[PDB]
Amino acid sequence: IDDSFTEGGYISVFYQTRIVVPLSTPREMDILGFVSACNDFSVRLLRDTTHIEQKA
Amino acid sequence: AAAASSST
Amino acid sequence: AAAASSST
Amino acid sequence: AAAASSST
Amino acid sequence: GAQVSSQKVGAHESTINYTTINYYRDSASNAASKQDFSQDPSKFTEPIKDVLIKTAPMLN
Amino acid sequence: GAQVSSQKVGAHESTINYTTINYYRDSASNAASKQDFSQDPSKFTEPIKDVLIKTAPMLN
Amino acid sequence: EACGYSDRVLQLTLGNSTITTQEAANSVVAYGRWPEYLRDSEANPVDQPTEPDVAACRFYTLDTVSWTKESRGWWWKLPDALRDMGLFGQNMYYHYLGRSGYTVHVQCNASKFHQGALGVFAVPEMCLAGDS
Amino acid sequence: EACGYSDRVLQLTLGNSTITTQEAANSVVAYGRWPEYLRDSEANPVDQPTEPDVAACRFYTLDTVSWTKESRGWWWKLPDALRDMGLFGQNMYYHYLGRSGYTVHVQCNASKFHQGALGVFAVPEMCLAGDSNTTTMHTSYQNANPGEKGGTFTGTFTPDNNQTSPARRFCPVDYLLGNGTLLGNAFVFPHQIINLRTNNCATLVLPYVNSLSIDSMVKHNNWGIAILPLAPLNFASESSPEIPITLTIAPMCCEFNGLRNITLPRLQ
Amino acid sequence: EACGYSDRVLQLTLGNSTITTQEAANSVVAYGRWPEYLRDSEANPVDQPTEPDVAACRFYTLDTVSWTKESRGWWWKLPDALRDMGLFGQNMYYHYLGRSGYTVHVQCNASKFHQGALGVFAVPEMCLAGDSNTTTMHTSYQNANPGEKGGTFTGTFTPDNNQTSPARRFCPVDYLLGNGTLLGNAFVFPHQIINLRTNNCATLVLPYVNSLSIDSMVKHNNWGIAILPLAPLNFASESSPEIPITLTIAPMCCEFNGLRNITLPRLQ
Amino acid sequence: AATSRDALPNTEASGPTHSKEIPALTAVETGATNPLVPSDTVQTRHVVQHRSRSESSIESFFARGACVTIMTVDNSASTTNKDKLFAVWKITYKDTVQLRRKLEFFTYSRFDMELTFVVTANFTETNNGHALNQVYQIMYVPPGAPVPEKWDDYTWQTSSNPSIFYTYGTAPARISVPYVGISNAYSHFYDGFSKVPLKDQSAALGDSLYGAASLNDFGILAVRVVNDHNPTKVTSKIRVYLKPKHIRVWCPRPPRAVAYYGPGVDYKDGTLTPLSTKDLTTY
């Protein structure tokens, strides 16, 4: 959960130089991002999620 | 008993 | 049984 | 077991 | 028929054990042992025909 | 998996024993054994860098 | 490979059909399991199976669709998409039971000056939602 | 020692700094544990630590304070009191995590005709009490971290009442060690007494203590140094005697994890 | 390599920083000497050195400059360009003496339809010429040390004439490498060329070079980095093309001697 | 190897002395306590010692269930302005004072926890109606999980949260919990903040409570009566008893001498004079 005592920090992305294209080429494009856990990752204290519910 | 009591 | 029964 | 069972 | 196993001890006060006996004939009646095995994620994380070496170019 | 230990007998009516068996897999479920160790108070009563001899002058 | 070979260049042959590709990104084997025939230990119907082999285990090309700036995506189901494909479809409709694995080859070339990315997903039991 | 050596005479050297004393009452090593670096078995952050060594593990002298007949006592927190001390403070603010032990050397000389006794206490997690009776746990970060200048004890609890715009600061009554417990029992904490007829310094070697292997040094103070007059200053017959107390502290076996841009804390 | 590996594709890691490149033209190690720490046989200051390791020996990216058809060239000095870079700059100003090697990574990508060639030169003791014809060796410390932003070459020597209140700055003419020698011969210095059709980066590993084992980093620059357009930027048909150049530099095996209070240089 | 229940050291016989060894003289400035025994300053006889420190070991000191809270729930008909009452409690040892004082003899601790629940009910009105036996649900809601808003909403399904269904009139309920800290030990005291106030950023944002670590340490207990309401109203109370088992403690502290005032070390005016009058030369 969001919590200052156990805050994890900041991810950010920047242009090091710049995107360069020739003529006849699109000047805008997309990047996609993915996240996954490393082999040293674990979780504990099983709990119910807030990502589903059954109001009535 | 020896056998059963299996142990892990 | 011998082993399992540990004793102290 | 032998020892554990003490008997009297 | 008793089955003796060891507990992975969390906060301490030799190995400590616990004892189990099955009372019923049907294995469905048995409690869960929790003595489970882990596998490696390969079949999901790397389902590729050619084995991958992480230090080399994924595409060559 | 039974564990046998001896009672420190208070008022008497050989050594007397009692028996324990752990029924649960989690060590947190276990009762307290009370089989505890004592330590010496030095780290609190004498936390000084130079070892002290009680018959000699504390300050010399 | 010092003698030439590469990840990007493959040749697949099944039956009387061969596919070549010079710009692949390797191949995927779902859950790391290669297609196989039903084992005796796992068998259930007791009758002698029909195994069409090369007659049905070959490459069928379906209708080419077209990708544009407004495309939202496409889907297909197996075996349904192959129900009319030669001797595979026939063996399919003549029998009560059947099982099959598949090599799926999606083809989409363009040019060094185009851009875009298609996600190709093989979903087990792909139950889709209705319009009601 | 027949060849000369004694309990009262010590030399301490760390980095480019040496301390001498001819009137010590030995040294104390808190809980009998000497400072040490984080072991692999106990390690937690996976990145290569920064270890400043001689650049940060040296003696920093803080501002000399003055002891008088009316002094009720002084306090400091670590690492806070050293936050601006040379390359130690810099390594501290550039990293998310850090750990350190300390050699604390309290200095107070006088004369064979003066008298008085200072209690020097090193308190693990020295949480002090606030000035409010209408709200709790409300002392502000700025008020809680005086830096090098430290804070002081008072002999009287006097509650901040400006409810509209509260003082938001500690109100540490001396006989209650500023935390609701009696001063007479603070001796269960690592300590030394500077009794003017016996010694002129106190030396305490403090290990890193915490419930974590390493933590945020900016958010959290591991140790409190409390100095209280067990027996009041007195000299010859002067109604207003005064003598200085100087604090010199050295970080020991200190290491830092989680490097980024510098933390610029709002300290006012 | 049959299993994939190539000259053009590198990964460099120092501290918490990793650089990747898919279009390199190998790497250069100046005079074939990899950076190293000061050996006991060659040591001179007797005090225990400070060695910042990962805290200072990491990649710092300086301000990106822009290459155009009118650019005549850029220069930087080391350690000066890194004087404000994190814990490296701090260790630098707290000590009298210091030594460092560097990995210099120059970054400049473009497209298969651009053209141009940058000469990247690492010059030992890069003394540059001043703007005056009435007095010599008179460029001021402030003017000589631009810090991270560096300076630039000009195609024309234009002498400062305000004799009453002189500019007191360098006037480095490009074809004379700003020092009175012909640019065509600067290739006797450790270098690489970024030719846009071939590569997009230059990587140079620079040892500590000097006539002393260790010296004043504040007073003295060991290396100069000079970047000059050997062949001018050109693209498709645009009369005003532009592409960025980014400099990333990492101190290597750096150590410092003579700790005191911080040096606060007048840099304006 | 010395165990908590071993007998203490025997007194040894000692006779007259006339020497240079000076056990009695010392210097407490050093920070040490003089390790003297009676034979050092008086003539002692020999005594075979039987007493042991068995009952003052750390386990033995804390081996008692202690009341940490009382929760009130009821079973009445939920009506437009007032609802059937379920209870929510943030788990802590600081709502009561007795165990809190005992734990605070120490800075840090480690233990497994045994929670025992005593449930009592009664009739709130001078009615005559009745109520059939009640079943109570005690759900543990860890920080992050959906907290219940109604005695009967979806959260009480407990698909993943641990719940206890207690039948009234049966033996008090009991469960055990491991050491669940995100630290290597529980901190009875935390001299710090959970937030660094950053100059550059506005003050209101930088702020946080002194001595408080994670806003929600261990989550909450949510208790309800599972039965639909009777016409007659029954109120119930759930008393929670906590016992630290398999406990370890570090860094001793002086005990709390003045009344607790909040979850921190704060003390309130007018509670600060504990000791009483007694003259210097009066036995």
Ligand SMILES: CCCCCCCCCCCCC/C=C\[C@H](O)[C@H](N)CO
């Ligand atoms: C169905 C019943 C489940 C009950 C589950 C309870 C799990 C949570 C245990 C609470 C742990 C509290 C330990 C006490 C407090 C901490 O020591 C202090 N705030 C210091 O860290």
Ligand SMILES: *C(=O)CCCCCCCCCCCCC
């Ligand atoms: C293996 O089980 C041999 C040892 C038996 C130990 C005593 C068992 C305790 C009572 C079990 C009765 C089973 C009930 C169906």
Ligand SMILES: *C(=O)CCCCCCCCCCCCC
């Ligand atoms: C070691 O335990 C072998 C001897 C077993 C003796 C009989 C145990 C009594 C019944 C225990 C069942 C355990 C319940 C989880």
